[PDB]
Amino acid sequence: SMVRTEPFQDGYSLCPGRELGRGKFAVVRKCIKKDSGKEFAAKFMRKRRKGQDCRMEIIHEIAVLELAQDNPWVINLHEVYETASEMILVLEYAAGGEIFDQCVAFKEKDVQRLMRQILEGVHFLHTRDVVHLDLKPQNILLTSESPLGDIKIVDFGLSRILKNSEELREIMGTPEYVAPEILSYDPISMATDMWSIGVLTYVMLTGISPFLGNDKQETFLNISQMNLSYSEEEFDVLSESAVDFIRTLLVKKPEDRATAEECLKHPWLT
C-alpha cells in the first residue's frame, strides 16, 4: 500500500461509544470520513509486540488484503496510515453489518447460501496460495443481520502463503534418510482451512460445537480421536446432503478432506 504519514484524524472523525472489536494487538473503531460522510472501520494495529517491532506483521496483512481486493467476500482496505507507534488500516464498514457470532440456529437454507459465499472466498484465497488458519465466527462478518446479508472475511493475522510440491520434496529431502516421525507428520496446508469450514458448517446447522469437550484435553482429545456420529436430535430436520457435506470436511487425515473447489460442487450447494 501507499502509506500515509499525515495525521489520520485530519481526514476522519472517530464515532462515539464502544469500539467495534478488539483483538490482540488490534482495535477496530467505527469512523466517519469528514469530507464524505462515509462510514469506515479503522483498524488500529500496534507496531510493537512484546517489545519487538512487528511492523512486518502489519505489512503482511495489507499484502493479503490487497491480494484479495477483487474478492467480493473479503473486506476492502480503503487506506493505510502510520504513526510512530501505530498503523491504521481504514477498512470498509458494513452498514448494519455484524459478526456472525453475535447474530445467534440458522435455517439450513440460510447456511447453504452463506457457506457457498464463505467457500468462494476461501477458494479464491487458496488459488492464491494463502491459507487463512483462523476461519471461525469471530472473523466472519455479515453485511446485514436482518435479513441475513453477505459474508465478509475480515482478519488475516494468522494467514500464510504456502509452498507447492516443494512442501513434500525439497523440504523432506532424500527419502532414505527421513526419520519415521516425519513420514507420520501432517503439516499445515489448505486442508487445515477446510477442517475449520467443516466445524463452522456443523455449528451453523445445529448450534453445537462438535468437538467441545469437558476440559481442553477433552477438546483436543475429541479432535484427535472422536469419530462423530451425527445422531443428535438436532439432525432429524437436516438433509442427508448436509451431513454428507460435513463428513467430507471433518476427516482427520488432511489429504482425504474435500477442497473448497470440490465443496462448491458438492450436491448440497448446487
Ligand SMILES: CC(C)(C)NC(=O)c1ccc2cc1OCCOCCNc1ccn3ncc-2c3n1
Ligand atoms: C480481527 C478483529 C477482531 C480485529 N476484527 C476486524 O479486523 C474487524 C474489521 C472490520 C469490522 C469488524 C472487525 O472485527 C469484528 C468486530 O465487529 C463486530 C461487529 N461490528 C461491525 C459492524 C460493521 N463492520 N464493518 C467492518 C467491521 C464491522 N464490524
